[PDB]
Amino acid sequence: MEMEKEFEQIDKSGSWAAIYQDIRHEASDFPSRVAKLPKNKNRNRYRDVSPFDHSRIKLHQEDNDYINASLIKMEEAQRSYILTQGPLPNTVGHFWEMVWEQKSRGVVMLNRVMEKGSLKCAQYWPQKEEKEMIFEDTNLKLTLISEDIKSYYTVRQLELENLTTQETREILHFHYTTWPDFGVPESPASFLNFLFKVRESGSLSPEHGPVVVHCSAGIGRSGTFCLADTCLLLMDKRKDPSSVDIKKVLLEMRKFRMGLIQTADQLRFSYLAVIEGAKFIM
């Protein structure tokens, strides 16, 4: 079926939970043996969210190459994304090592450091120009260059330096600051505006390594971001945009990381975002 009218048909029939459970039943199951090794317990935020072995990002290190991060490679859309958990106190250096090694231009953050009164990820970037951060375990230096605070999101320019080679690179930090503590946003308008700002920066384009996207677990809000982006790109590329099947695209992405889209409300919000976004594109 088309999307907008499939949408109204699920709303009128109140069957979002049944649609979402079908997705969960059909989703791929692949091994994640490296994630579950005992030496990696303090590298995982949640015991039930792990990268598959076949798609995990490897750190360029001979001691321990593990990080909770996955490469989502979308062949028809010609887009790639790295989805990862919010960094932990003992993985902030690994996180920036990955950004460096994978040649990423942008980092997309969809959570606040504290939500619901608890810590959802480490404070992994510097908050003042004159107070830079040094990650001694991976030999990197990170400096805040500039910050632009808007009503729904903040954009930061950061300098990452590889202290072994003295090479430097500019990294863009795109921080969506207004996702509610509970539920999903009422309107997708600010989320779409944010997606378009990431696109306009070049961070999603083939001349750079894949964008790094995270929330707390790296599957819920993060899944919504890449699902909406890929669906809108396919609607631009194809002769028949009504052929784009958002449930099929989501199942394709779940071949590369488990659990993408965590609730039926996130599934409905993804439909809403793609539907509204397709009208603005034209």
Ligand X SMILES: OCc1ccccc1N1CCOCC1
Q: Residues annotated as binding site?
A: 181, 215-221, 262
User: Residues touching ligand X: how many (CB under 6 A)?
Assistant: 7
DSSP state at residue 18:
H
What CA–CA distance (Å, rounded) separates 89 from 58?
Answer: 19
Enumerate residues 169-228 that contact ligand X by CB under 6 A.
Answer: none
DSSP state at residue 260:
-
Q: Is 127 helix (H, G, I), strand (E, B) or coil?
A: coil
Please tell me the total number of residues recorded for the chain in this structure.
282
- Considering only 40-48, 100-108, 130-138, 259-267, which stretch makes contact with ligand X by CB under 6 A? 130-138
Question: Can you tell me which residue has the tokens 């996130």?
Answer: 266
Of 89, 38, 46, 100, give the one whose Cα is nearest residue 66: 38
- Considering only 72-80, 127-135, 174-182, 269-277, which stretch makes contact with ligand X by CB under 6 A? 127-135
Decide: is 89 part of the binding site for ligand X (CB under 6 A): yes
Decide: is 122 part of the binding site for ligand X (CB under 6 A): yes
Kindly tell me which of 28 and 127 has the beta carbon lying closer to ligand X.
127
Decide: is 114 part of the binding site for ligand X (CB under 6 A): no
Residue type, 213: V
Q: Based on the residue annotation, tell me whether 215 is a catalytic residue of this protein.
A: yes
- Per the annotation, binding residues for substrate are 181, 215-221, 262
Catalytic-role residue among 121, 215, 226, 231: 215
Decide: is 123 part of the binding site for ligand X (CB under 6 A): yes
- List CB contacts of 49: < 8 A, sequence separation 6 or more: 68, 85, 217, 218, 219, 258, 259
Decide: is 92 part of the binding site for ligand X (CB under 6 A): yes
Q: Are strands 140-149 and 133-135 parallel, antiparallel or unpaired?
A: antiparallel
Decide: is 42 part of the binding site for ligand X (CB under 6 A): no
Of residues 20, 81, 95, 135, which one binds ligand X by CB under 6 A?
Answer: 135
Burial of 121 (0-12, 13-18, 19+ CB in 10 A): buried
Decide: is 133 part of the binding site for ligand X (CB under 6 A): yes
142 beta partners:
133, 160
Binding site residues, ligand X, CB under 6 A: 89, 92, 122-123, 133-135
Residues labelled as active-site residues: 215
